[model samples]
Target: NTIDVYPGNDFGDDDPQYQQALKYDDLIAIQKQPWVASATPAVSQNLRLRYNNVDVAASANGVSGDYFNVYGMTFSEGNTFNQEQLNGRAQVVVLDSNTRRQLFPHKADVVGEVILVGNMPARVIGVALRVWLPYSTMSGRQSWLNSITVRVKEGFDSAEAEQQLTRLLSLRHGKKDFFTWNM
Candidate 1:
């Protein structure tokens, strides 16, 4: 079966628990680990509204969807961020058609431009087709994610990526349950 991975870090970081879980090192480590086909770590904050004839909104996220293909999203134009684009001063972000309709309504508008997301600047590179997700993937309790995605390589797995991740993290966390898994 094809497995899609997104970090189930649990949202709401007005306090420290959520914030602490988003440690860059931890996320980077996951990608470095074996069996981790592709991992994307996203920090979603605020909405993305474009006013003043230029796409701008509270839509600011340090998101990286370097390899977000397992979700089965159709690619219309540009796509999500890549590893090389990460850590850039003016970050790059990819959007789904649902989000692009608002940001880029016309065709004349260029794709790569400085868009303000909650006072943070991010460049839009591409757009994915309308993402209508099911309850099992992006609905119910797992609907909104704090965003730590994990994917297992195809044709090379006897188990789930979540299980392998658990095995690895548990080794470090020492049975503290650093994160939770739904499936």
Candidate 2:
């Protein structure tokens, strides 16, 4: 089973439940836990992507290295982010089928070409249906994350896993109001 976890206080800082954003340590904790199979954090924004004269509006998702694995996403061409790329926040991107066609038009292989994502030049490393650069590249080395996608390990149902994970985050945050989850 898989679940997407989002922290509380998504609205404003003036609220008492503020500053409950998901943290890097939470991801580490999830990874280290035996009940979790894999997890990846992501943050997204809408931006205009440009290549040559083609400019298309799209939602850009900045994700961790395990994003493709956790989400079970497959690449149609090239490859996903390697550990090096993830840690270094490489300027690489995997375009969805639609984006590929929108940017390349009649072209087939766009793997090594440079494309502009909100003024940042990123090399097309793969062609897949999801995600963008390593999140650090988009938002810098922020300690907190917007959400985490998790895949539970064997022997745990979605409900059970959610409870366990919720309990874990609650303890870390010191309250159950600090985060929320969905299967």
Candidate 3:
């Protein structure tokens, strides 16, 4: 069986529970643990965040303020989908608490459902669907893990977010040097 991994951090500073969880080192320790199996292990992988046109630095504030909902899907190394699968399909949708508005649109326009033909069946979402990459063309199978997101309002500071996240992770995990490797 394939297993997917994700961080437990909420990526926000407003929530009381997430704030509380952020005080502990368990989250980072969990992330540091290795993935194990008994088989020959054809491959090893980890889930990384990918966004479409939405700018990480730009949208981070909106995301922290709970202005949008975030959703994601996992595709194997080589998977392809037809128009039907590519059409409106989303397994998850994130929403803002105060406004109750979906941070991101739910339809296929904002999200894409992936269905590989005649082999393994899985649903894929996001801009990653539009292109036919070498890994996706091979029809590899992967599992979707829980999404890591933050809720922020307009003018959300990406730098602040990074700093806060890094500080929190370091304090909890005791890995003071950990940094976000994003551009």
Candidate 4:
């Protein structure tokens, strides 16, 4: 069956999904290696896992910024476009080093289309050449998604941390339905 995926703005004001997302976030915050690394034991032990890695630096500055902007701000990961076209009519093109072709990569093309149509014109930034994993490999026949494995902070037990995170999420979300066994 095809489920209708809702856009970010379509969520109701008091949607359970939002709360569930938050709870999972808090649970993740407690398990995040970076947070645990920077946190004191008291805070770390009780830390809500809110994997806002993109906003960590900005939140320190007390300013709110778009997480995608912050995430795509850095091109070190090798999956971003190099030149940003702001003129509004030009094709958002990127240098595909692998194919040795000057082509409109999916992301750049999307940004360009948005700009031409007077939608949210994203400012292009540096590009990072990286391998795109196949959907089958990413989804494991379930769902296509991004996954990253994080290290536990030094002096912390990974197994114990995972158990704590699982219990916390299960309690908050009323079921551990969102996360798969591997995630």
Pick the TM-score winner: 2
Candidate 1's C-alpha runs over 4 A off are: 1-41, 51-62, 87-90, 129-144, 149-164, 167-183
Please give the distance, in angstroms, between residue 112's alpha carbon in candidate 1 and its true position after superposition: 1.7
Of candidates 4 and 3, the better by lDDT: 3
Model 1, 138-165: lDDT tens digits are 1111112344656656665635566677
lDDT by residue (23-87, candidate 3, tens digit) is 21333333342321211111112322133332111110101111111123233222333323323
RMSD of each: 10.4, 8.9, 16.5, 16.8
Per-model lDDT: 0.47, 0.72, 0.27, 0.26
| Residue 183 local lDDT, model 4 | 16
Give the poorly placed runs of model 3, Cα more than 4 Å off: 1-147, 176-183
lDDT of 2 by residue, 59-170 (tens): 6778766555544567888888887887787889888889898888888688999999888889999887233777767764223455677888888777878888888887
Give me the candidate number with maximum lDDT. 2
Q: Work out candidate 2's RMSD over C-alphas.
A: 8.9
Return the TM-score for candidate 3, rounded to 2 decimals: 0.25
In the range 1-183, model 4's lDDT, one tens digit per residue, is 101111122323223333223322543554453314321110001111112121111000000112123223333323332222221222222212331112232332322221110121222222332222111111211111122123346676655655654555456656443331211
Give candidate 4 regions above 4 Å deviation: 1-20, 24-35, 38-121, 124-151, 180-183
**Model 1 — which ten-residue stretch has the worst lDDT?**
134-143
- TM-score against truth, every candidate: 0.46, 0.59, 0.25, 0.28
